[PDB]
Amino acid sequence: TAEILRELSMECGLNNRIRMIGQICEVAKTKKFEEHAVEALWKAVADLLQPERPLEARHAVLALLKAIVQGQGERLGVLRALFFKVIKDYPSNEDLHERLEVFKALTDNGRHITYLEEELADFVLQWMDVGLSSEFLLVLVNLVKFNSCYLDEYIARMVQMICLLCVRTASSVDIEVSLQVLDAVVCYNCLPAESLPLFIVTLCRTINVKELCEPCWKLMRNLLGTHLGHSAIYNMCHLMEDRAYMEDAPLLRGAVFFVGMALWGAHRLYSLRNSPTSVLPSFYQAMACPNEVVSYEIVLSITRLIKKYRKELQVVAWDILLNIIERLLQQLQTLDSPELRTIVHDLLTTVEELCDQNEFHGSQER
């Protein structure tokens, strides 16, 4: 570096400061800096992070930081803590993209968090509120994937915030990545019981968009297979039952879909010791307010239930399941859809087939 500090320090003009800081950026990512020079360069442009200087100066100094991280890197040591303190305890709040560019280089997209380990826990929340932006959710995926060990007190709050981002954001890729953030929370950590009900609600809401369908089910599988699976099934059932939630059709499409899918769908997860006999009464109240697409999910999921678990459905369960069909038929009058007509007819046709096969063991009278 040598005497170039003459042009980097406060004595030289701001335009020339930026010019020479660009010339430093090129050596920062390509030359072996002499020892202690990182903090000397930083001291020469630490005031460039000041609002009176335009955002050009802020970008130039953040580019210097990023280039120093890129080139000198593993020799920063405690200067990693210094740079992360700069990015976190920012003497502004405007720039996010460039600070995130520096942070990505500082942690290799979020997998290498040495010396900044403790303060990263607060930084995650602070940056989330300052912005739940897309690239930051990439970084958050990597953080929970490899470094959840320091977010332990805040996983509850991270889930509570992510539930309320997944409910509302115009950028589709935002939720495409938020599903990955939750996938990390599900697979490389565990969710508090004070967070799980809101996770269930947000997943049930989230699946309703077509591009997100398979990723959302993959996430639901990854959670519903864990120990949380049983509490989750019971919470989904109670979301079907409580009078307060009754009108929420898109939620109930999620709830019907996931419960049926997990217990008796094609990709069933066998750890769930919840009998269909105890779950079908929640499907009862899933139809307390008729709807044109929720009951389509009910009839499809019950179609896989009956066509697969023909024999396990014994008489008390059938007494319930026949009333399920009774509600479906009462709704068939007014839901009117050709697809619903077709699938309900197919369901009753399969019940008839299984009755001829005597695979149906329920009450023939009713």
Binding site: E35, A37, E39, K43, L82, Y150, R273
Partner: protein, 319 residues
Amino acid sequence: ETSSQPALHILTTLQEPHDKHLLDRINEYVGKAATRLSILSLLGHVIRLQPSWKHKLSQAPLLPSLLKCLKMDTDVVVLTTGVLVLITMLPMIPQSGKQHLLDFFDIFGRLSSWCLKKPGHVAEVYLVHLHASVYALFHRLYGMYPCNFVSFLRSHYSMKENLETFEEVVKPMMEHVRIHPELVTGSKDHELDPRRWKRLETHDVVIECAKISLDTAHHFVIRKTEELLKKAKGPMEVLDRLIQQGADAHSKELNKLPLPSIRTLRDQLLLLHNQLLYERFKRQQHALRNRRLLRKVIKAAALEEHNAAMKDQLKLQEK
């Protein structure tokens, strides 16, 4: 009948043969059941004040009578009173270790198992007081007879029938005691020698015990410790410094460069202090990781895995 303080002042300063009559009548009233709690309270109050006859407790039948009560009775109030009386007596009659060391250890073990079992027919408050008394007894015994008490702990809590008692009751107490220096310089019979006990007054015994002591039932002893002491007596900075020090150091190197183009020792001193700042920052980070770990293990401590397995066994009503 009165709890009269002036009468207690008469009793605390008696002389022969009234001295003998007092210890005889206390001993009689400890023998009988009805008078036992009352006279144990009298004994505690009198003994607290270091009576004129303080050294005759070491051989009177009253000490065996108190120890007998503490090994036979089940009244938690009586047991707690007697234990606290005994603890108060030990610095006043430390010579009696040579006679009743095994009885002190038997009382400690018995009431540690009591703290483990917790009979619910008596109040939880009384049992917390009893556990605080057992804690005080552990501390007093370890302070006064370190090698003897450590030998008793090893021989009595390495038995399979008391390891649960150990971990649940005694092992937490071991957190609050240093390693006694007599474990390196002492002996078992050196703690029973009458000469050593005579060379120390009551206060000095207690001071030595305090030298090796430190600081839910643990909440009770902490609170009572702080209350009685009130009666008795009225990292980012390191990082911010090291970056500046590094800037100065690079400035020094920039001053060297003109010379090819005394200060050496100041340069080395600043460089050295820079390394101390690095080491101090590392120590703070290390302490932070540690505090985080204490939190994690606290939240992992709650463990009913046995009950979970039993619920799995009942879940086999799947059969």
